[PDB]
Design a protein around this ligand. Structure first.
Ligand SMILES: [Mg+2]
Ligand SMILES: [Zn+2]
Ligand SMILES: [Zn+2]
Ligand SMILES: [Zn+2]
Lengths: 168, 43, 49, 196, 559, 159, 263, 133, 141, 114, 65, 85
DNA sequence: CGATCCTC
RNA sequence: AGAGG
C-alpha cells in the first residue's frame, strides 16, 4: 500500500479539521453531487503536461493514473462524511490545496537530473560496509553482493562470479 | 624513531592480511591504514 | 638514549627499510586456471648466495 | 588523543569557574563526549582511567599490561578503599549555577597526547595571488599563497544545483579567463593581435 | 582533467572545522583573519556610499573594512600601501573590494564531493579563533566530524552569482533531499540523547528553569504556558517546554508497538498544533526520518521556518542537558553477577552442541544434505551455534541493563550504539572470520603453534568467548586482530573503487536534463524518458503514503 | 520462500512456496522444462534476460539488480535515479556499459568524451573523421569557459 | 547578626572550612566563582632577559616566573598599569624584581623564589615579596644551573585577575557541597544493586539530620546551608580571599546600580 | 463554567512502569457501575496506593499568560490537593451508549469511560483536573 | 646453557608451545567471575614455552594500556597516532640543528603503564600528560 | 592567532556601554537589558534575586555565545512597577545580603586560633 | 624537564615540594603515596603533578655549555 | 522563423526556480549598476532585496526565452509567469 | 587502456 | 616519495 507519491492528502485533511474547527457532532452541509463530482473535477485539473492533443493528453492521463487512484480512495463519499466529517467550505479548500501542491510538486525544466541520479547512487555506494555478503552465516546463501556486484553490473560483466537461476 | 628503525616493506597470493605465521614475529596491530595497509609491517 | 642503527649521509640520518622478498630455492606447487591446457605447475626460484 | 584511537580537536576553552567541579574542588583539564564511546568499544580507555585514578590516590604505578589478571573488580575494590565510588563516578556541580548535576560523571586521570598539525599551521585563504607560468592559473600550497582546487568532483555538484553562472565564474574570473582572436575563415588562433 | 574540468581558484579558504551549538543551521563561522583576506567587489551606489566610504577608511587590518579600490579606467588602489589610503573620496561606478562580512552567501564544501549537499551556500558569521564553525545538524550531508577534518569556502564575486547560491544552493533549501525523498539533516548527538531524556513522563521542571528555557527560544511569543501540574507545586513537563520550539499547525501521528492512543509505554507520537500530546521524542521523530518532524515542518511551514527549528530545538535541549548532565563510565559495561553466570553457561552449552556435532561428524553419522559437502554442513552448523550463543548471551546482558545505564540510554535515544556493541563489550565478543569463513589453518593443520594438529574446536578457530570488559586471551586477541585487519584492507580497497564508480556514473549521465517539454534528454537531444521518472515529478516533493484501495479484506473494502 | 497472496476473503496472506535456487544459468532451456512457472522464472544474469526475453525485460532485471545492491545494505535511493541509469544503459538497443568502451564510444561530443578516458586518442580519431562538436554538452562549455545550458543557462533572458 | 550566616569549623594559615547558612544557591556560587576569578593580585607580567645560558628557553623561564606567588596583602593601594597615567610602568602600578644567578659551584646550583629581589620603591606596602611556604627556607625552584651557566633578568610584577590569566589567582581548589543526604533530590544516583551502599557518605552528613525512610518528598524545599573550604595559594591570606571575594562581588553589583544612574 | 464532571473513584491498580515519580492509576467509580478511569499521577507530590477513595473533578476556568501563584488574596477553585491542566485529544465512542474521553496533561495521559459526559467535555485545549483526599 | 632457543616460522611448524609457564603445565584434581575465561591444558607434549604473550606486539602497540580490552582496529589506529604525538624525542635536542622539532614543555610519565615500556624507555622520554578528564555532555561544544 | 585579547572579557571597548535597556515588543511592561563584559557570576545572581520579588512576572538570562562576555536579562513586572526599579531593588538587596555576610565572616574569623 | 610551579588543574603551588619529595623517598625511606600526603598534596590532581613528573633537567645539565 | 505562436503554448505557465534565480540575479546586477528602480523602496538598500520586491510587485521588464529541443523557443514575460514557488 | 579527496 | 580526513 505504502508508496512514495506527491501531495500528502492526510496532512491536508488534518489541516482543514483544525483550520475550519470541524466538530464530529454536527451534520455536514455537503451533498453526494458535491463530493462525487468534486473529486471528479479535481482529477481534470492535476496538470503535468499542457498539450492540446491526443498523444500528450494520454501521456498526461498515464502520468497521473496512480496519484488519482490514491485521490479517489482517500476522498470517497463515505470516507469524507463518515471518517473526516468535512463541511462544504472545508472540503472545497482541501480540493484547492491538492491542485496547488500537485503543480508545485512537478519537476522544473533545466533540472540536471543526470548528475542528480549518478550522485544519488554513487554516494550510498561509498557508504557500503560488508561488500562480500551479510548472508555468510548459512552455506546455501553464497551470492556476490555489495560493491563487487555493483561493479559487475555497471561494467556489464560477461561472466558473473555467482550466476544464479531462481525457479518457481 | 624506534618504530621507524623496526619497519618492513613488501612491494607490489593475498599479502595484506595478517597471516597466522606472523605470530610473535610481526606486530598484529601496527600497520598503516589505507594505501599500503598490511604491506608496511613492524617487527 | 639514542639507539643507532642508521647512517649520517650529507648530515641527514638515513634508516634502511627491511625489504620483504620471497625466499629462493623453494619448491612450490600450484593449480593453474580454468581454461588453461596445463593443470598443475611445480616451480623453483633457483638462486646463489 | 588518548592511547586508544580517540582523535579529537578542541571545541572550546573554558576557564575554571565555568567548568563543572567535584565536591573536592577538582575540575577537569579536559572534557570528552560519552557518544564517542559505545560504537568505538574502547573499554580499555575507561579501565585506564579507573586504574590511573586509583594510582594517583595510592601513589603507585598502575599496571596496564595486556595478558594479566588485573580486573575491573579488583581496581574498583581499591578505588572504593580510597573513599570514591568503585566505578569512577563522581557527583559533579554545574559551574554557571552551582547546582548539582542530575547525572554523575566518570571522572579521573587519563594519559592524553598533544599531536602535530595545529590549526594555525593549516589556516589558509587566498583572494588573488601568484599564478603558475604555463597554465596562467593559481599556484599550489599555502607556503606559496596558493589557490584551493575546485576539482571536477566539485564542478559536478554545481551542475546538480543548476548554478550555471557560478560554475562559469569559478572557471573564468576566479581562475584563468583570457581573450584570444579568431578569424571567421580558418577558425584558428592564427590572427595577429595588433591593438591600438 | 586537471586544468579544464577542475582547477585552483582565487577567493578560496580552507581550515579545520569545529562544532557550534549557538550558530544557525545555514550559518558558517568564518575566522576574522580569513574574513580579512577574502573580498567582494561592491560597486558604489547611493544606497551603500556611506558604508563603503567608512569601510574604505577602516582599512585592510580592521575587520569591517576593505582591501583594494577600483577606479574608472580600471586601476587598483592598494589600501595596505597607498599614500592616499587615508584620503580616498569615493565616486559612483567605482568598485570597492570590501572584506567578507556577516550574512554574505558563501559556498561551503567538504571533500569528497559525492553530493549536491556536499556543497551548500551558508550565511556568513565572522568569529574569533582559527576554526570554521558549523551547526551539528549540517554535519551529516557534508559527512563531517570535528576530529581534524578541514573544509573549503568559495566566495561569489558577481551579484547574479550570489543569487544562485541564495536562491538555489542555500542550506534550508537542501533540508528535504531528492536522493531518498526524505530530509538529509536531523537532531544528533547531545541534542538527540538529551531530547529523549527531557521528553520523558518522569521529567518535570520548576518555574526558575522554565522561564530560562522559554527565553532561550528566540521566536518565543512571551506567553508563559500553563503548567501540567498546579498541585503542591507549579510543575512543567519536558514535553510542554519543547512544544514551544514546535510551530503552530504542525500535525504528526505515529504508532510503534504498544501504542494505543493511551501510550502506556509512552511510545509512538502525537503532535496537535504547536503541542505534543504523547510519545517520547527520539530518532524516529527528530532524526532525519521519512515521516518525521523535519519532513513535516519543511513541507508545511517552509524551508526558512524549518531551518529555524533546528536552532530552537538545539538551544532548549542543550541548555536543559547542560544543567542535567550526561556521562558514561566503565560501570555501564558491567552486567549482573547472576547475569554473568547465565552468560558463561550459555556459551558452555553452545560449546557442547559443537562438540556433539564434531563427535557425530567423526563417527560418519553426519547426513549428506543436498548441494553441500559433508564438511561444509559441519562448518555451517558450528558457525550457527556460535553466532546463536553470542546473540543469546548479548540479549541476556542487554536485558539486565537498567534504564539508568548510560549505554542503554544512548541506544534508546538513537544518538549512539546498537545491540551488537552492548553484546561484545559486556557479554561475549564472538566468532572471528577471514574470507567469510572462521580462522583457517595457516600452519600445517593448525591455526597457532599453541594448539595441536587437526583442531576444529571453537577456541582454535577464532571464537572469542570473552567480552572486552573481561579481556581477550592471547589466542583470542591475535584472532580478533586477523579479522580486524581484513576490515581495514576492505576499507582501503572500497574508498578507491567506490570513488571510481561514482566518477563513471557522473560522466555517463552529465548531460541528461529535464527539457521544456517535460522530457528527459541528453546533449544530442535523444529521448531517455518521456516524463521524468515516469510521472514528471520532483523527488523532493514526494513521500510514502498508503493506497487504501489495495489492502484489507473484501468485507472491509465494502464497509 | 515467503509469498504474499490474496486469500478468498480478500485480505493478503502468507502462502509458503517451494522455489529452486540454481548454481548456474541456461534460461533458454530451463524455462521450456515442464512443471515450472515460465512467467515467474528469474536469473541475476540481466544479459541472459535481455537475450531470451528482450530489451524491455532486460531493463526490468537491470533495475531489479541495481536496486538489490542498495537494498541489501539497508540504504534507499528514489526509484527515478536508478530508473535513469537503467534506461541509459537500455536506450541504445542493448546493454551499454558504464566503461570507456561502453558510453564513451557513443556518438557524443568529442570534447565531452575526451574528459573521461582515452583523452588524446579520442581527440585523434575526432581529428581524422573531422567531427563537428554541437557544444550543447556540459563538458564542452566547462572547457570553453561559457555559461552551459544547465538549469540557469537552459533559457535566454530578453529585454 | 542578620541575613546570611557563617560558621567556621576549621581555620589555618592556608585553609578555611565553613558552613554558609541562610543564603541562596546563586549567591553561594557567585561567591565561589568570584573567589577563583575576579579578586585582584600581583604577578610578573613582563620579563626582560639580559643573559640566559641555562638548559631552559627564555619564555619557558618567563612562563614559570609569572607563576611564582608574590605578596598581595596591600594590592588595593597599587594601580592597574592600564589606568595609571605613566608611560609603561612606575612605582604606583608595578614592582620591579631582579634575578641574577651563576653556576659558581661544580655541583648543580638551584635558582629559588627567594633569589628574586625587589628593585622598585615599595612605598611602605606589603607587596611584591615572593611567597615562601617551604620549611627549608626557599620558595619555588625556578631553574637549575651547571657551571659555565648564567641567568640575568628583570621582572615587572603587575596587578590583574584570573579572568586575564590563571597566574593572578589567589586560587587553589574551593570545596563546595550542599545537602549531603540528597534530600532535595538534586541528583539521581547511578547504581548496580544499592545506591546507599555503592556511594560513600559525606563528611558533611554529621552536620545534617538523615531523611526519615517512609517520609513524603519535600517538594517546596530549597538550597540553603552550603559546606565550603577555601584554600589560599599564599598571595593573599585565607580570610581575605573570602572577604575580598564578598567585596569584589559587592562592588560589581554596585557597578550595575551606578550604570542605571548614568542612564 | 464551573465543573463539567464530578465523581468518587476507587483504586484497583497502581503501576510505576519504569518511572520513579509517575504511576498509572486504574480506577472505577463507587456510585456508577459503568464509569471507568485511567490516569497518570505524579506520586512524588501526591501519592496514591491500593484501595483509595479519590474525588475526581473536571473544571474549565479556575488564552492569557501564566502569572506566579502570589496567593496574597488570590482564590483558585480548589479545596483540592492535586491540580492539573490539559488538552482534549480524542472522543472515541466505545459502543451503543458508551463514550470515552482522552486528555493529555503535558504527556500525563487520561481516559474516562461512561455516557453521563454528554455536551460538556466538547474538544478543548482548556481542561482542568482536580483531585482531593 | 640451552635454557632458551631461537625459532623461526618454518621450525615453529614442528613444535608445541605453552602460553604461560605455570598455568600451562602444573597438574589437576572456586573461580573468580571477574577474570577472563581461559581454555585449559588439553595439549600435553610441550617442547617450548612463550617467554611472554605480550611480546607478540611491537614498539607502538607496546605503549597502549590494556589492548586486550580494545577493538582490533582501535589498536591499529593508536599505533599510527603515537608517532604523531609530541614529547622529548632525545635529551640533546637543543644541541641538534634539525628541521622541525616539537618538545613538550612539561612531559609526564603515564599513570597506567605496560611492562614493555621499561625497555621502550617511555617513562624516561614521555609523549603525553596525565590529564584529569571528565566523560560528559556539557555545553555541547 | 585569531584569539581575542583576554582584557576583552572584563574591559569595555570604545562605544561599549555597560547596560542597554531595550523595550520588549512581544510582552507588556517587558524589557531586555544587555550586560556587557559580564558572565554567569552576575547573571545568575541578579536573576535569582529578581525572582524572589513577588512583583516580578518574568526573569531570565542567557549567554548567547561563550566567545563573548555579554548576557541578556529579560524582565516583566506588574502594572505600576518599572523593570528598571525591579533591577535596582534586586541589586541593593544583593549588596545588603553581602554586607551582612562580610561582617558575619569577620566576627566568626576573630573567634578562631590558627 | 623541571618541576612545574602550581597544579594545572587546581593551582596549588607544587614548585616548592620536589626537593622535599626526593628527600622523603631517599633519606626518610617513605613510600610515594605516604610521601605525597606529607607534603599536603591531598587531591589526585596535585598527586599526579609530582608522582608523574620526569625531571629531565638533570640529564640536560650533563651537556657542557 | 523559428519562434512559436502566441496562442497554444505547452510550456509551464509557472516560473521555474532557475528562471527566478537568473531573473533575480540579472536585476540585482543592474540595480548595483545604478539602474532605475520600478517600485517604492521602503528602506531597501540591497540590490537582491529590491529585485525581490520588483518581482513581488511584478514590475520587471524582462522576457524568458524557453528553448525547446527541436531548436525552437517560447517567449514568456515575467509579468505573465505565475510565481508560486 | 583505469584505480576517492586533501595539504609538506 | 611520507602523512591527514
Ligand atoms: Mg573524521
Ligand atoms: Zn584564417
Ligand atoms: Zn604607572
Ligand atoms: Zn591540584
Amino acid at each position: 500500500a505504502n508508496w512514495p507519491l506527491p501531495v500528502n492528502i492526510r496532512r491536508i485533511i488534518q489541516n482543514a479539521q483544525q483550520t475550519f474547527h470541524i466538530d464530529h457532532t454536527k451534520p455536514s452541509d455537503l451533498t453526494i453531487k458535491d463530493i462525487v463530482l468534486g473529486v471528479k473535477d479535481l482529477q481534470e485539473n492535476l496538470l503535468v503536461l499542457r498539450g492540446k492533443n491526443e498523444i500528450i493528453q494520454n501521456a498526461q492521463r498515464d502520468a497521473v493514473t496512480l496519484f488519482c487512484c490514491l485521490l479517489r480512495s482517500r476522498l470517497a463519499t463515505r470516507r469524507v462524511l463518515q471518517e473526516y466529517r468535512l463541511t462544504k467550505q472545508a472540503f472545497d479548500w482541501v480540493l484547492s490545496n491538492i491542485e496547488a501542491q500537485f503543480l508545485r510538486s512537478v519537476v522544473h525544466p533545466g533540472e540536471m537530473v543526470g548528475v542528480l541520479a549518478a550522485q544519488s547512487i554513487g554516494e550510498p555506494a561509498t557508504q557500503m560496509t560488508l561488500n562480500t555478503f551479510h548472508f555468510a552465516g548459512v552455506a546455501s546463501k553464497k551470492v556476490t553482493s555489495g560493491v563487487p556486484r555493483l561493479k559487475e553490473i555497471l561494467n556489464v560483466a560477461k561472466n558473473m562470479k555467482t550466476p544464479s537461476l531462481t525457479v518457481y | 624513531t624506534l618504530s621507524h628503525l623496526r619497519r618492513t616493506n613488501t612491494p607490489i597470493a593475498k599479502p595484506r592480511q595478517l597471516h597466522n605465521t606472523h605470530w610473535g614475529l610481526v606486530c598484529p596491530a601496527e600497520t598503516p591504514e589505507g594505501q599500503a595497509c598490511g604491506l608496511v609491517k613492524n617487527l | 638514549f639514542d639507539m643507532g642503527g642508521y647512517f649520517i649521509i650529507n648530515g641527514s640520518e638515513k634508516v634502511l627499510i627491511a625489504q620483504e622478498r620471497s625466499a629462493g630455492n623453494i619448491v612450490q606447487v600450484f593449480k593453474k586456471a580454468a581454461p588453461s591446457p596445463i593443470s598443475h605447475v611445480a616451480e623453483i626460484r633457483s638462486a646463489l648466495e | 588523543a588518548s592511547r586508544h584511537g580517540q582523535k579529537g580537536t578542541i571545541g572550546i576553552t573554558y576557564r575554571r569557574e565555568d567548568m563543572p567541579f567535584t565536591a573536592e574542588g577538582i575540575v577537569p583539564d579536559l572534557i570528552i563526549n560519552p557518544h564517542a564511546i559505545p560504537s568505538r568499544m574502547t573499554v580499555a580507555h575507561l579501565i585506564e582511567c579507573l586504574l590511573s585514578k586509583v594510582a594517583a590516590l595510592s601513589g603507585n604505578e598502575g599496571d596496564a599490561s595486556p595478558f594479566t589478571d588485573i580486573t575491573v573488580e579488583g581496581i574498583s575494590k581499591l578505588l572504593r578503599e580510597h573513599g570514591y565510588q568503585s566505578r569512577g563516578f563522581e557527583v559533579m556541580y554545574n559551574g554557571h549555577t552551582g547546582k548539582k548535576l542530575m547525572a554523575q560523571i566518570f571522572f579521573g586521570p587519563t594519559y592524553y597526547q598533544r599531536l602535530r598539525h595545529m590549526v594555525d599551521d593549516k589556516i589558509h585563504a587566498r583572494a588573488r595571488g601568484p599564478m603558475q607560468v604555463l597554465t596562467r592559473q593559481p599556484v599550489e600550497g599555502r607556503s606559496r599563497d596558493g589557490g584551493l582546487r575546485f576539482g571536477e568532483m566539485e564542478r559536478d555538484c554545481m551542475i546538480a544545483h543548476g548554478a550555471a553562472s557560478f560554475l562559469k565564474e569559478r572557471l573564468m574570473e576566479a581562475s584563468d579567463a583570457f581573450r584570444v582572436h579568431i578569424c571567421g575563415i580558418c577558425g584558428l588562433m592564427t590572427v595577429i593581435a595588433k591593438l591600438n | 582533467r586537471g586544468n579544464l574540468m577542475g582547477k585552483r581558484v582565487d577567493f578560496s579558504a580552507r581550515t579545520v572545522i569545529s562544532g557550534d551549538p549557538n550558530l544557525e543551521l545555514d550559518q558558517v563561522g568564518v575566522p576574522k583573519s580569513i574574513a580579512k583576506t577574502l573580498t567582494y567587489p561592491e560597486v558604489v551606489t547611493p544606497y551603500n556610499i556611506d558604508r563603503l566610504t567608512q569601510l574604505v577608511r577602516n582599512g585592510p587590518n580592521e575587520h569591517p573594512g576593505a582591501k583594494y579600490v577600483i577606479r574608472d579606467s580600471g586601476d587598483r588602489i592598494d589600501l595596505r600601501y597607498s599614500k592616499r589610503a587615508g584620503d580616498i573620496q569615493l565616486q559612483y561606478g567605482w568598485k570597492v573590494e570590501r572584506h567578507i562580512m556577516d550574512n554574505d552567501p558563501v559556498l561551503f564544501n567538504r571533500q569528497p564531493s559525492l553530493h549536491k549537499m556536499s556543497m551548500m551556500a551558508h550565511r556568513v558569521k565572522v568569529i574569533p579563533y582559527s576554526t570554521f564553525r558549523l551547526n551539528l545538524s549540517v554535519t551529516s550531508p557534508y559527512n563531517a566530524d570535528f576530529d581534524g577534518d578541514e573544509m573549503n569556502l568559495h566566495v561569489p564575486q558577481s551579484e547574479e552569482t550570489r543569487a544562485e547560491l541564495s536562491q538555489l544552493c542555500a542550506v534550508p533549501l537542501q533540508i528535504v533531499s531528492p536522493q531518498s525523498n526524505k530530509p538529509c539533516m536531523g537532531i544528533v548527538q547531545d541534542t538527540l540523547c538529551g531530547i529523549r531524556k527531557l521528553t520523558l513522563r518522569d521529567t518535570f521542571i520548576e518555574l526558575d528553569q522554565v522561564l530560562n528555557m522559554l527565553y532561550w527560544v528566540p521566536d518565543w511569543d512571551g506567553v508563559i504556558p500553563t503548567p501540567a501540574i498546579i498541585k503542591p507545586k507549579p510543575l512543567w513537563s519536558g514535553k510542554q517546554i519543547l512544544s514551544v520550539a514546535i510551530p503552530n499547525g504542525i500535525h504528526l501521528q505515529r504508532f510503534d508497538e504498544g501504542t494505543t492512543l493511551l501510550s502506556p509505554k509512552d511510545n509512538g507520537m502525537l503532535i496537535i498544533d504547536g503541542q505534543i500530546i504523547f510519545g517520547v521524542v527520539e530518532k524516529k521523530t527528530v532524526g532525519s526520518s521519512n515521516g518525521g518532524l523535519i519532513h513535516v515542518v519543511t513541507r508545511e511551514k517552509g524551508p526558512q521556518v524549518c531551518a529555524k527549528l533546528f536552532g530552537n530545538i538545539q538551544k532548549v535541549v542543550n541548555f536543559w542537558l547542560l544543567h542535567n548532565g550526561f556521562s558514561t563510565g566503565i560501570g555501564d559495561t558491567i552486567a549482573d553477577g547472576p547475569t554473568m553466570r547465565e552468560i558463561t553457561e550459555t556459551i558452555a552449552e553452545a560449546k557442547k552442541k559443537v562438540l556433539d556435532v564434531t563427535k557425530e561428524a567423526q563417527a560418519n553419522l553426519l547426513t549428506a544434505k543436498h548441494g553441500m559437502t559433508l564438511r561444509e554442513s559441519f562448518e555451517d552448523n558450528v558457525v550457527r551455534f556460535l553466532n546463536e550463543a553470542r546473540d543469546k548471551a548479548g540479549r541476556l546482558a542487554e536485558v539486565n541493563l537498567k534504564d539508568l545505564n548510560n549505554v542503554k540510554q544512548m541506544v534508546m535515544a538513537g544518538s549512539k550504539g546498537s545491540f551488537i556493541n552492548i553484546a561484545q563489550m559486556s557479554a561475549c565478543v564472538g566468532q572471528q572470520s577471514v574470507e567469510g569463513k572462521r580462522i583457517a589453518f595457516g600452519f600445517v593443520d593448525r591455526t597457532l603453534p599453541h594448539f595441536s594438529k587437526d583442531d576444529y574446536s571453537p577456541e582454535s578457530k577464532g571464537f572469542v568467548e570473552n567480552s572486552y570488559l573481561r579481556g581477550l586471551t592471547p589466542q583470542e586477541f591475535f584472532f580478533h586482530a586477523m579479522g580486524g585487519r581484513e576490515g581495514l584492507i576492505d576499507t582501503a580497497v572500497k574508498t578507491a573503487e567506490t570513488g571510481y564508480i561514482q566518477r563513471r556514473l557522473v560522466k555517463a549521465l552529465e548531460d541528461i536534463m529535464v527539457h521544456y517539454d517535460n522530457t528527459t534528454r541528453n546533449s544530442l537531444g535523444n529521448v531517455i524518458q518521456f516524463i521524468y521518472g515516469e510521472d514528471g515529478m520532483d523527488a523532493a516533493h514526494i513521500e510514502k503514503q498508503s493506497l487504501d484501495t489495495i489492502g484489507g479484506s473484501d468485507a472491509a473494502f465494502e464497509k | 520462500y515467503d509469498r504474499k497472496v490474496p486469500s478468498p476473503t480478500g485480505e493478503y496472506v502468507k502462502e509458503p512456496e517451494w522455489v529452486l535456487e540454481t548454481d548456474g544459468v541456461n534460461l533458454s532451456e530451463v524455462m521450456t522444462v515442464p512443471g515450472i512457472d515460465p512467467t515467474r522464472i528469474y536469473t541475476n544474469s540481466f544479459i541472459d534476460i535481455m537475450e531470451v526475453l528482450g530489451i524491455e525485460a532486460g531493463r526490468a532485471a537491470l533495475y531489479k539488480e541495481v536496486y538489490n545492491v542498495i537494498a541489501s545494505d539497508g540504504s534507499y535511493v528514489n526509484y527515478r535515479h536508478m530508473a535513469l541509469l537503467v534506461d541509459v544503459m537500455t536506450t541504445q538497443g542493448g546493454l551499454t556499459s558504464v566503461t570507456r568502451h561502453g558510453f564513451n564510444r557513443s556518438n557524443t561530443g568529442a570534447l565531452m568524451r575526451c574528459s573521461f578516458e582515452e583523452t588524446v586518442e579520442i581527440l585523434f580519431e575526432a581529428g581524422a573523421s573531422a567531427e563537428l562538436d554541437d557544444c550543447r554538452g556540459v563538458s564542452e562549455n566547462v572547457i570553453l569557459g561559457q555559461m552551459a545550458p544547465i538549469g540557469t543557462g537552459a533559457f535566454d533572458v530578453m529585454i | 547578626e542578620e541575613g546570611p550566616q557563617v560558621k567556621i569549623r576549621e581555620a589555618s594559615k592556608d585553609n578555611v572550612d565553613f558552613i554558609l547558612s541562610n543564603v541562596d544557591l546563586a549567591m553561594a556560587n557567585s561567591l565561589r566563582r568570584v573567589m577563583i576569578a575576579e579578586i585582584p593580585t600581583l604577578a610578573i607580567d613582563s620579563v626582560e632577559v639580559e643573559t640566559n645560558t641555562t638548559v631552559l628557553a627564555d619564555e619557558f623561564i618567563a612562563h614559570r616566573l609569572g607563576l611564582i606567588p608574590l605578596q598581595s596583602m596591600d594590592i588595593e593601594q597599587l594601580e592597574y598599569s592600564r589606568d595609571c597615567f605613566c608611560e609603561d610602568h612606575c612605582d604606583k602600578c608595578s614592582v620591579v624584581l631582579t634575578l641574577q644567578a651563576f653556576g659558581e659551584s661544580e655541583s648543580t646550583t638551584n635558582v629559588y623564589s627567594k633569589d628574586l629581589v625587589i628593585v622598585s620603591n615599595l612605598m611602605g606596602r606589603n607587596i611584591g615579596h615572593p611567597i615562601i611556604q617551604d620549611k627549608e627556607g626557599n620558595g619555588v625552584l625556578i631553574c637549575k644551573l651547571r657551571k659555565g651557566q648564567e641567568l640575568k633578568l628583570t621582572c615587572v610584577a603587575k596587578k590583574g585577575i584570573a579572568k586575564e590569566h590563571a597566574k593572578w589567582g589567589p586560587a587553589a581548589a574551593i570545596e563546595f557541597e550542599y545537602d549531603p543526604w540528597n534530600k532535595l533530590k538534586h541528583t539521581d544516583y547511578w547504581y548496580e544493586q544499592d545506591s546507599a551502599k555503592e556511594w560513600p557518605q559525606s563528611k558533611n552528613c554529621e552536620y545534617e539530620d538523615p531523611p526519615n525512610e517512609g517520609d513524603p518528598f519535600d517538594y517546596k524545599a530549597q538550597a540553603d546551608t552550603f559546606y565550603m573550604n577555601v584554600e589560599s595559594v599564599g598571595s593573599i591570606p585565607v580570610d581575605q580571599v573570602v572577604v575580598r571575594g564578598i567585596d569584589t562581588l559587592q562592588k560589581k553589583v554596585a557597578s550595575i546600580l551606578l550604570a542605571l544612574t548614568q542612564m | 463554567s464551573n465543573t463539567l464532571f464530578d465523581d468518587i473513584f476507587q483504586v484497583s491498580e497502581v503501576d510505576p512502569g519504569r518511572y520513579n515519580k509517575v504511576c498509572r492509576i486504574e480506577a472505577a467509580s463507587t456510585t456508577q457501575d459503568q464509569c471507568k478511569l485511567t490516569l497518570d499521577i505524579n506520586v512524588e507530590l501526591f501519592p496514591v496506593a491500593a484501595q483509595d477513595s479519590l474525588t475526581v473533578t473536571i473544571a474549565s476556568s479556575l488564552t492569557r499568560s501564566w502569572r506566579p501563584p502570589q496567593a496574597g488574596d488570590r482564590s483558585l477553585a480548589d479545596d483540592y490537593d492535586y491540580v492539573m491542566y490539559g488538552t482534549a485529544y480524542k472522543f472515541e465512542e466505545v459502543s451503543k451508549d458508551l463514550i470515552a474521553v482522552y486528555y493529555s496533561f503535558g504527556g500525563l495521559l487520561m481516559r474516562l469511560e461512561g455516557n453521563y459526559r454528554n455536551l460538556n467535555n466538547l474538544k478543548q485545549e482548556n481542561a482542568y483536573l482536580l483531585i482531593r483526599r | 646453557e640451552g635454557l632458551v632457543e631461537y625459532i623461526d616460522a618454518e621450525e615453529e611448524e614442528s613444535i608445541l608451545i605453552a602460553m604461560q609457564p605455570e598455568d600451562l603445565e602444573p597438574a589437576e584434581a572456586d573461580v573468580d567471575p571477574a577474570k577472563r575465561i581461559r581454555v585449559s591444558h588439553h595439549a600435553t607434549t610441550f617442547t617450548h614455552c612463550e617467554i611472554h604473550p605480550s611480546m607478540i606486539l611491537g614498539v607502538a602497540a607496546s605503549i597502549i594500556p590494556f589492548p586486550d580490552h580494545n577493538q582490533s582496529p582501535r589498536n591499529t589506529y593508536q599505533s599510527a597516532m603515537g608517532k604523531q604525538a609530541m614529547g622529548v624525542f632525545l635529551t640533546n635536542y637543543n644541541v641538534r640543528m634539525d628541521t622541525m622539532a616539537n618538545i613538550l614543555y612539561y612531559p609526564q610519565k603515564p599513570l597506567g603503564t605496560t611492562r614493555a615500556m621499561e625497555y621502550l624507555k617511555f617513562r624516561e622520554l614521555p609523549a603525553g600528560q596525565n590529564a584529569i578528564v571528565a566523560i560528559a555532555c556539557y555545553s555541547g561544544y | 592567532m585569531n584569539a581575542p585579547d583576554r582584557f576583552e572579557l572584563f574591559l569595555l571597548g570604545e562605544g561599549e556601554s555597560k547596560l542597554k535597556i531595550d523595550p520588549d515588543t512581544k510582552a507588556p511592561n517587558a524589557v531586555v537589558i544587555t550586560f556587557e563584559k559580564e558572565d554567569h557570576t552576575l547573571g545568575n545572581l541578579i536573576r535569582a534575586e529578581l525572582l524572589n520579588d513577588r512583583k516580578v512576572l518574568f526573569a531570565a538570562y542567557k549567554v548567547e555565545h561563550p566567545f563573548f562576555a555579554r548576557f541578556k536579562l529579560r524582565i516583566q513586572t506588574t502594572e505600576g512597577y518599572d523593570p528598571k526599579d525591579a533591577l535596582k531593588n534586586a541589586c541593593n538587596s544583593i549588596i545588603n545580603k553581602l554586607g551582612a555576610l562580610k561582617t558575619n565572616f569577620e566576627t566568626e574569623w576573630n573567634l578562631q586560633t590558627l | 624537564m623541571i618541576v612545574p610551579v602550581r597544579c594545572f588543574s587546581c593551582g596549588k603551588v607544587v614548585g616548592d615540594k620536589w626537593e622535599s619529595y626526593l628527600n622523603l623517598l631517599q633519606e626518610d625511606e617513605l613510600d610515594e603515596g605516604t610521601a605525597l600526603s606529607r607534603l599536603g598534596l591531598k587531591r589526585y590532581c596535585c598527586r599526579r603533578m609530582i608522582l608523574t613528573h620526569v625531571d629531565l633537567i638533570e640529564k640536560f645539565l650533563r651537556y657542557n655549555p | 522563423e523559428k519562434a512559436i505562436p502566441k496562442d497554444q503554448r505547452a510550456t509551464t505557465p509557472y516560473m521555474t526556480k532557475y528562471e527566478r534565480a537568473r531573473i533575480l540575479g540579472t536585476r540585482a546586477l543592474q540595480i548595483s549598476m545604478n539602474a532605475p528602480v520600478f517600485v517604492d523602496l521602503e528602506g531597501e538598500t540591497d540590490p537582491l532585496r529590491i529585485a525581490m520586491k520588483e518581482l513581488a510587485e511584478k514590475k520587471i521588464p524582462l522576457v524568458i526565452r524557453r528553448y525547446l529541443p527541436d531548436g525552437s523557443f517560447e517567449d514568456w514575460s515575467v509579468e505573465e509567469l505565475i510565481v508560486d514557488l
